[PDB]
Design a protein around this ligand. Structure first.
Ligand SMILES: [Mg+2]
Ligand SMILES: [Mg+2]
Lengths: 131, 131
């Protein structure tokens, strides 16, 4: 279904990368934060939900969605309840950027635009088609 | 044209809101930062460019795109060179959230999803149609 997203955290250089994947397309959005917290996860979800018609979110760590602030964000936004190559691409460009956050966003760019259609083309088509 | 975006900063509560508008749709993305800096503007652009096929960016303050870090981001990403209602919507929900950043993202959500199609529907259609 086009409203389904997966969200997980990965760790790199003592920082945390929040990665959201649109399951039907493989499109990704990510952000770098200092550490995993409910406040960060809630903020990320609210941003995501304002961009895309987000219906359901899955995760590989259920406990990360247990805070009051995260349940509040899912409530208000009407939400119900890849790190393999992404880390490959980050390593490849890591040299080219000073800050890890900059390398992560270059990696997301590369991932979303690389063709086999690209993930970014597929999300827009999947969603436009459903309107 | 569907690759054209406008980016500007506004000030509220001693903070800065970076607002990007997809000119053909009226779709917006925003972020809250402590103050205007080239590093922030460059990061925002790199994020945006990884999400959408960004071709050209306009602004109402040209000097904000003069730093080395901003020119670097536009170079790597292949980029060449609403605050009215947004501030209305922020005021309306501001009470409902503690932190300004949370109110800004609720406002972006409201803006992008409100129908007359919504801005979020129009961007996806405009872009899908162009692929
Ligand atoms: Mg996780
Ligand atoms: Mg400005």
């Amino acid at each position: 279904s086009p409203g389904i997203w997966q969200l997980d955290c990965t760790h790199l250089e003592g920082k945390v990368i929040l990665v959201a994947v649109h399951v039907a397309s493989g499109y990704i959005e990510a952000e770098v934060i200092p550490a995993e917290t409910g406040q960060e996860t809630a903020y990320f979800l609210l941003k995501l939900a304002g961009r895309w018609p987000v219906k359901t979110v899955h995760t590989d760590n259920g406990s990360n969605f247990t805070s009051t602030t995260v349940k509040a964000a899912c409530w208000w936004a009407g939400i119900k309840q890849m790190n393999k190559e992404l880390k490959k691409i980050i390593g490849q460009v890591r040299d080219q950027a000073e800050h890890l956050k900059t390398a992560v966003q270059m990696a997301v760019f590369i991932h979303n635009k690389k063709r086999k259609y690209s993930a970014g083309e597929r999300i827009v088509d999947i969603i436009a088609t459903d309107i």
